[PDB]
Amino acid sequence: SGVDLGTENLYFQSMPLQLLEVKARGRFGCVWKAQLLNEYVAVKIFPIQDKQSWQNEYEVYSLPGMKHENILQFIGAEKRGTSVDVDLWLITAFHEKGSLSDFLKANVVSWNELCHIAETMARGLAYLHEDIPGLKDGHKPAISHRDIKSKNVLLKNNLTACIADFGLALKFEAGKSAGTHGQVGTRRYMAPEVLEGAINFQRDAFLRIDMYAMGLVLWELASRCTAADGPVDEYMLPFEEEIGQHPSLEDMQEVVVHKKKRPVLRDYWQKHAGMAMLCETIEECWDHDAEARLSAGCVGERITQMQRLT
Ligand SMILES: Cn1c2c(c3ccc(Cl)c(Cl)c31)CCNC2=O
Protein backbone atom coordinates (compact mmCIF):
# COMPACT_ATOMS: atom_id res chain seq x y z
CA SER A 1 0.00 0.00 0.00
CA GLY A 2 1.83 3.12 -1.30
CA VAL A 3 3.03 4.89 -4.48
CA ASP A 4 6.78 5.28 -5.16
CA LEU A 5 7.86 8.60 -6.77
CA GLY A 6 11.54 8.72 -5.53
CA THR A 7 11.99 12.07 -3.68
CA GLU A 8 13.44 13.16 -0.26
CA ASN A 9 12.13 11.26 2.79
CA LEU A 10 12.24 11.63 6.59
CA TYR A 11 12.87 8.86 9.14
CA PHE A 12 10.89 7.38 11.98
CA GLN A 13 12.72 4.73 13.99
CA SER A 14 15.22 4.59 11.08
CA MET A 15 12.39 3.73 8.70
CA PRO A 16 11.64 5.95 5.51
CA LEU A 17 8.66 8.21 6.18
CA GLN A 18 6.93 10.67 3.86
CA LEU A 19 3.96 12.96 4.46
CA LEU A 20 1.23 12.81 1.82
CA GLU A 21 -1.40 15.42 2.66
CA VAL A 22 -3.35 16.89 5.55
CA LYS A 23 -6.35 14.61 6.13
CA ALA A 24 -8.02 16.27 9.15
CA ARG A 25 -7.66 19.01 11.73
CA GLY A 26 -7.80 17.73 15.31
CA ARG A 27 -8.57 19.84 18.35
CA PHE A 28 -4.85 20.01 19.10
CA GLY A 29 -3.02 19.27 15.94
CA CYS A 30 -2.89 18.46 12.30
CA VAL A 31 -3.49 14.87 11.06
CA TRP A 32 -1.43 13.84 8.02
CA LYS A 33 -1.81 10.83 5.85
CA ALA A 34 1.73 9.49 5.59
CA GLN A 35 3.72 6.55 4.33
CA LEU A 36 5.96 4.62 6.71
CA LEU A 37 8.00 1.89 5.10
CA ASN A 38 5.20 0.20 3.06
CA GLU A 39 2.10 1.25 4.94
CA TYR A 40 -0.05 4.28 5.27
CA VAL A 41 -0.09 5.78 8.77
CA ALA A 42 -1.46 8.99 10.32
CA VAL A 43 1.06 11.49 11.71
CA LYS A 44 -0.58 13.92 14.06
CA ILE A 45 1.61 17.00 14.47
CA PHE A 46 0.97 19.22 17.51
CA PRO A 47 2.19 22.82 17.81
CA ILE A 48 4.41 23.47 20.80
CA GLN A 49 1.61 25.36 22.64
CA ASP A 50 -0.41 22.11 22.69
CA LYS A 51 2.46 20.10 24.18
CA GLN A 52 0.23 19.12 27.09
CA SER A 53 -2.34 17.44 24.80
CA TRP A 54 0.44 15.55 23.01
CA GLN A 55 1.67 14.40 26.43
CA ASN A 56 -1.89 13.53 27.55
CA GLU A 57 -2.55 11.40 24.46
CA TYR A 58 0.80 9.60 24.75
CA GLU A 59 0.12 8.94 28.43
CA VAL A 60 -3.36 7.59 27.65
CA TYR A 61 -1.97 5.30 24.99
CA SER A 62 0.69 4.13 27.51
CA LEU A 63 -1.89 2.98 30.01
CA PRO A 64 -2.30 -0.77 30.56
CA GLY A 65 -4.49 -2.55 28.06
CA MET A 66 -4.71 0.19 25.39
CA LYS A 67 -4.73 -2.11 22.36
CA HIS A 68 -8.16 -3.01 21.03
CA GLU A 69 -9.87 -3.44 17.66
CA ASN A 70 -12.20 -0.49 18.43
CA ILE A 71 -9.52 1.93 19.72
CA LEU A 72 -7.43 3.71 17.04
CA GLN A 73 -4.13 1.80 16.91
CA PHE A 74 -1.17 3.65 18.47
CA ILE A 75 2.13 3.22 16.55
CA GLY A 76 4.45 5.69 18.28
CA ALA A 77 5.12 9.18 19.61
CA GLU A 78 8.22 11.32 19.50
CA LYS A 79 9.56 14.72 20.48
CA ARG A 80 11.85 15.62 17.57
CA GLY A 81 13.70 18.65 16.10
CA THR A 82 15.36 20.97 18.62
CA SER A 83 14.22 22.57 21.91
CA VAL A 84 13.83 25.83 19.94
CA ASP A 85 11.81 24.24 17.07
CA VAL A 86 10.07 21.30 18.64
CA ASP A 87 8.30 18.79 16.42
CA LEU A 88 5.72 16.83 18.40
CA TRP A 89 4.47 13.73 16.57
CA LEU A 90 2.00 11.04 17.38
CA ILE A 91 1.60 8.27 14.86
CA THR A 92 -1.42 5.98 14.57
CA ALA A 93 -3.04 3.73 12.04
CA PHE A 94 -4.52 5.46 9.02
CA HIS A 95 -8.03 4.63 7.74
CA GLU A 96 -8.96 5.74 4.24
CA LYS A 97 -12.63 6.15 5.00
CA GLY A 98 -11.75 8.62 7.77
CA SER A 99 -14.22 9.84 10.37
CA LEU A 100 -17.79 8.73 10.65
CA SER A 101 -18.55 12.40 10.06
CA ASP A 102 -16.89 12.49 6.66
CA PHE A 103 -18.39 9.11 5.77
CA LEU A 104 -21.98 10.11 6.59
CA LYS A 105 -21.62 13.33 4.67
CA ALA A 106 -20.97 11.41 1.46
CA ASN A 107 -22.70 8.07 2.18
CA VAL A 108 -25.80 6.47 3.67
CA VAL A 109 -25.84 3.23 5.69
CA SER A 110 -28.27 0.28 5.62
CA TRP A 111 -29.82 -1.05 8.79
CA ASN A 112 -27.23 -3.74 9.15
CA GLU A 113 -24.28 -1.37 8.42
CA LEU A 114 -25.66 1.03 11.02
CA CYS A 115 -25.76 -1.87 13.50
CA HIS A 116 -22.12 -2.78 12.79
CA ILE A 117 -20.82 0.75 13.17
CA ALA A 118 -23.01 1.34 16.26
CA GLU A 119 -21.97 -1.88 17.99
CA THR A 120 -18.27 -1.47 17.30
CA MET A 121 -18.26 2.19 18.35
CA ALA A 122 -20.12 1.29 21.55
CA ARG A 123 -17.70 -1.53 22.29
CA GLY A 124 -14.75 0.79 21.84
CA LEU A 125 -16.26 3.37 24.17
CA ALA A 126 -17.17 0.67 26.73
CA TYR A 127 -13.62 -0.62 26.68
CA LEU A 128 -12.23 2.92 27.11
CA HIS A 129 -14.65 3.31 30.01
CA GLU A 130 -13.88 -0.02 31.67
CA ASP A 131 -11.72 -0.47 34.73
CA ILE A 132 -9.74 -3.64 34.03
CA PRO A 133 -7.53 -5.12 36.71
CA GLY A 134 -5.12 -7.97 36.13
CA LEU A 135 -3.57 -7.18 32.79
CA LYS A 136 -0.03 -8.34 32.19
CA ASP A 137 0.95 -4.67 31.87
CA GLY A 138 -0.99 -3.51 34.98
CA HIS A 139 -4.41 -2.11 35.97
CA LYS A 140 -6.33 -0.31 33.23
CA PRO A 141 -8.26 2.60 34.65
CA ALA A 142 -11.68 3.77 33.44
CA ILE A 143 -10.96 6.61 30.99
CA SER A 144 -13.40 9.41 30.01
CA HIS A 145 -12.92 10.67 26.45
CA ARG A 146 -14.40 14.17 26.92
CA ASP A 147 -14.96 14.91 23.20
CA ILE A 148 -17.06 12.13 21.81
CA LYS A 149 -18.40 13.12 18.40
CA SER A 150 -18.65 11.67 14.89
CA LYS A 151 -15.33 13.36 13.95
CA ASN A 152 -13.56 11.24 16.54
CA VAL A 153 -14.97 7.88 15.43
CA LEU A 154 -13.04 6.42 12.50
CA LEU A 155 -14.21 3.70 10.11
CA LYS A 156 -12.05 0.85 8.93
CA ASN A 157 -12.48 -0.67 5.46
CA ASN A 158 -15.37 -2.94 6.52
CA LEU A 159 -17.03 -0.12 8.52
CA THR A 160 -15.68 -1.28 11.90
CA ALA A 161 -15.55 1.84 14.09
CA CYS A 162 -12.73 2.89 16.39
CA ILE A 163 -12.40 5.69 18.94
CA ALA A 164 -9.77 8.37 18.23
CA ASP A 165 -8.19 11.40 19.88
CA PHE A 166 -7.25 11.17 23.54
CA GLY A 167 -5.93 14.76 23.93
CA LEU A 168 -8.69 15.55 26.45
CA ALA A 169 -9.12 12.11 27.92
CA LEU A 170 -9.00 11.79 31.68
CA LYS A 171 -8.41 8.59 33.62
CA PHE A 172 -10.07 7.75 36.92
CA GLU A 173 -8.33 5.52 39.48
CA ALA A 174 -11.34 5.11 41.84
CA GLY A 175 -15.10 5.78 42.18
CA LYS A 176 -14.90 8.47 44.94
CA SER A 177 -15.90 12.10 44.13
CA ALA A 178 -13.30 14.97 44.19
CA GLY A 179 -15.58 18.11 44.37
CA THR A 180 -15.94 21.11 38.82
CA HIS A 181 -16.81 22.99 35.56
CA GLY A 182 -16.06 21.02 32.39
CA GLN A 183 -16.65 22.75 29.05
CA VAL A 184 -13.53 21.36 27.32
CA GLY A 185 -15.30 19.43 24.56
CA THR A 186 -17.35 20.33 21.51
CA ARG A 187 -20.20 22.58 22.44
CA ARG A 188 -23.10 20.98 20.44
CA TYR A 189 -22.39 17.60 22.03
CA MET A 190 -22.20 18.95 25.62
CA ALA A 191 -24.67 17.40 28.14
CA PRO A 192 -27.10 19.78 29.96
CA GLU A 193 -25.10 19.68 33.23
CA VAL A 194 -21.95 20.65 31.29
CA LEU A 195 -23.70 23.59 29.56
CA GLU A 196 -24.90 24.80 32.97
CA GLY A 197 -21.29 24.67 34.14
CA ALA A 198 -21.79 22.66 37.33
CA ILE A 199 -20.44 19.04 37.49
CA ASN A 200 -19.29 16.30 39.86
CA PHE A 201 -15.60 15.50 39.61
CA GLN A 202 -16.36 11.81 39.82
CA ARG A 203 -15.89 8.92 37.38
CA ASP A 204 -19.57 8.22 36.75
CA ALA A 205 -20.37 11.90 36.15
CA PHE A 206 -17.73 12.03 33.42
CA LEU A 207 -18.78 8.70 31.84
CA ARG A 208 -22.45 9.93 31.70
CA ILE A 209 -21.27 13.03 29.85
CA ASP A 210 -19.61 10.81 27.16
CA MET A 211 -22.80 8.75 26.93
CA TYR A 212 -24.98 11.81 26.19
CA ALA A 213 -22.61 12.70 23.33
CA MET A 214 -22.66 9.11 22.09
CA GLY A 215 -26.45 9.29 21.99
CA LEU A 216 -26.07 12.18 19.55
CA VAL A 217 -23.64 10.16 17.41
CA LEU A 218 -26.20 7.37 17.25
CA TRP A 219 -28.78 9.92 16.09
CA GLU A 220 -26.35 10.94 13.33
CA LEU A 221 -26.22 7.27 12.22
CA ALA A 222 -30.05 7.01 12.33
CA SER A 223 -30.40 10.26 10.31
CA ARG A 224 -28.45 8.73 7.45
CA CYS A 225 -29.92 5.23 7.60
CA THR A 226 -31.98 3.68 4.79
CA ALA A 227 -33.80 1.21 7.11
CA ALA A 228 -37.44 0.87 6.09
CA ASP A 229 -36.72 2.64 2.79
CA GLY A 230 -37.82 6.20 3.63
CA PRO A 231 -36.50 9.63 2.72
CA VAL A 232 -32.97 10.43 3.84
CA ASP A 233 -31.86 14.03 3.89
CA GLU A 234 -28.40 15.47 3.52
CA TYR A 235 -26.14 15.06 6.59
CA MET A 236 -26.75 17.62 9.36
CA LEU A 237 -24.86 18.09 12.63
CA PRO A 238 -26.82 17.41 15.81
CA PHE A 239 -28.79 20.60 16.61
CA GLU A 240 -27.86 22.21 13.26
CA GLU A 241 -31.52 22.31 12.22
CA GLU A 242 -32.42 24.12 15.51
CA ILE A 243 -29.40 26.48 16.04
CA GLY A 244 -27.08 26.22 13.03
CA GLN A 245 -23.50 25.27 12.51
CA HIS A 246 -21.85 27.62 15.03
CA PRO A 247 -23.98 27.90 18.16
CA SER A 248 -23.18 30.18 21.10
CA LEU A 249 -23.17 28.73 24.63
CA GLU A 250 -26.41 30.66 25.16
CA ASP A 251 -28.12 29.04 22.11
CA MET A 252 -27.16 25.59 23.36
CA GLN A 253 -28.36 26.40 26.84
CA GLU A 254 -31.74 27.51 25.47
CA VAL A 255 -32.36 24.45 23.23
CA VAL A 256 -30.75 21.72 25.36
CA VAL A 257 -31.27 22.90 28.98
CA HIS A 258 -34.33 25.19 29.10
CA LYS A 259 -36.34 23.58 26.32
CA LYS A 260 -34.98 20.07 26.91
CA LYS A 261 -34.98 19.53 23.16
CA ARG A 262 -33.02 16.96 21.21
CA PRO A 263 -32.56 16.13 17.57
CA VAL A 264 -35.80 14.96 15.99
CA LEU A 265 -36.55 11.23 15.98
CA ARG A 266 -38.65 10.96 12.81
CA ASP A 267 -42.12 9.38 12.99
CA TYR A 268 -41.58 6.99 10.09
CA TRP A 269 -38.60 5.41 11.99
CA GLN A 270 -41.05 3.98 14.51
CA LYS A 271 -42.46 1.63 11.81
CA HIS A 272 -39.18 -0.36 11.62
CA ALA A 273 -38.80 -2.46 14.75
CA GLY A 274 -34.99 -2.11 14.75
CA MET A 275 -35.08 1.65 14.32
CA ALA A 276 -37.76 2.00 17.05
CA MET A 277 -35.50 0.18 19.45
CA LEU A 278 -32.55 2.38 18.33
CA CYS A 279 -34.70 5.45 19.05
CA GLU A 280 -35.50 4.21 22.58
CA THR A 281 -31.80 3.60 23.20
CA ILE A 282 -30.79 7.08 21.96
CA GLU A 283 -33.46 8.65 24.21
CA GLU A 284 -32.02 6.93 27.28
CA CYS A 285 -28.51 8.04 26.25
CA TRP A 286 -29.42 11.73 26.00
CA ASP A 287 -31.70 11.95 29.01
CA HIS A 288 -31.65 15.21 30.95
CA ASP A 289 -31.21 13.04 34.04
CA ALA A 290 -27.57 11.95 33.94
CA GLU A 291 -28.19 9.00 36.27
CA ALA A 292 -30.82 7.78 33.85
CA ARG A 293 -28.31 7.47 30.98
CA LEU A 294 -27.31 4.06 29.79
CA SER A 295 -23.73 2.83 30.26
CA ALA A 296 -21.57 2.26 27.20
CA GLY A 297 -21.66 -1.54 27.80
CA CYS A 298 -25.45 -1.56 28.07
CA VAL A 299 -25.71 0.25 24.72
CA GLY A 300 -23.44 -2.43 23.24
CA GLU A 301 -25.94 -5.06 24.19
CA ARG A 302 -28.99 -3.12 23.07
CA ILE A 303 -27.42 -2.89 19.65
CA THR A 304 -26.68 -6.62 19.57
CA GLN A 305 -30.30 -7.17 20.67
CA MET A 306 -31.77 -4.87 18.04
CA GLN A 307 -29.52 -6.38 15.31
CA ARG A 308 -30.92 -9.80 16.27
CA LEU A 309 -34.50 -8.49 16.38
CA THR A 310 -37.06 -10.70 14.84
C1 LIG B 1 -5.99 9.91 14.03
N1 LIG B 1 -7.07 10.72 13.51
C2 LIG B 1 -7.64 11.74 14.16
C3 LIG B 1 -8.67 12.30 13.27
C4 LIG B 1 -8.62 11.57 12.08
C5 LIG B 1 -9.41 11.67 10.92
C6 LIG B 1 -9.19 10.76 9.90
C7 LIG B 1 -8.19 9.77 10.06
CL1 LIG B 1 -7.94 8.69 8.76
C8 LIG B 1 -7.42 9.67 11.21
CL2 LIG B 1 -6.22 8.41 11.38
C9 LIG B 1 -7.65 10.58 12.24
C10 LIG B 1 -9.56 13.52 13.67
C11 LIG B 1 -9.12 14.25 14.96
N2 LIG B 1 -8.19 13.43 15.69
C12 LIG B 1 -7.41 12.31 15.52
O1 LIG B 1 -6.69 11.83 16.37
Swiss-Prot record:
It comes from Homo sapiens. Its main location: membrane. ATP binds at K23, A24, R25, G26, R27, F28, G29, C30, V31, K44. Residues 17-309 form the Protein kinase domain. GO terms for biological process: activin receptor signaling pathway; anterior/posterior pattern specification; BMP signaling pathway; cell surface receptor protein serine/threonine kinase signaling pathway; cellular response to BMP stimulus; cellular response to growth factor stimulus; determination of left/right symmetry; embryonic skeletal system development. Residues 16-310 are cytoplasmic. Its EC number is 2.7.11.30. The chain holds residues 191 to 486 of 513 of the full protein. Keywords: ATP-binding, Cell membrane, Disulfide bond, Glycoprotein, Kinase, Magnesium, Manganese, Membrane, Metal-binding, Nucleotide-binding, Receptor, Serine/threonine-protein kinase, Signal, Transferase, Transmembrane, Transmembrane helix. This is Activin receptor type-2A. GO terms for cellular component: activin receptor complex; cell surface; cytoplasm; inhibin-betaglycan-ActRII complex; plasma membrane; receptor complex. On ligand binding, forms a receptor complex consisting of two type II and two type I transmembrane serine/threonine kinases. Type II receptors phosphorylate and activate type I receptors which autophosphorylate, then bind and activate SMAD transcriptional regulators. Receptor for activin A, activin B and inhibin A. Mediates induction of adipogenesis by GDF6. One of its GO terms (molecular function) is protein serine/threonine kinase activity. Belongs to the protein kinase superfamily. TKL Ser/Thr protein kinase family. TGFB receptor subfamily. It catalyses: L-threonyl-[receptor-protein] + ATP = O-phospho-L-threonyl-[receptor-protein] + ADP + H(+); L-seryl-[receptor-protein] + ATP = O-phospho-L-seryl-[receptor-protein] + ADP + H(+). Part of a complex consisting of MAGI2/ARIP1, ACVR2A, ACVR1B and SMAD3. Interacts with MAGI2/ARIP1. Interacts with type I receptor ACVR1. Interacts with BMP7. Interacts with TSC22D1/TSC-22. Interacts with activin A/INHBA. It is a single-pass type I membrane protein. Its cofactor is Mg(2+); Mn(2+). The lineage of its organism: Eukaryota, Metazoa, Chordata, Craniata, Vertebrata. It is found in: Cell membrane. The active site is at D147 (proton acceptor). The keyword Disulfide bond applies.
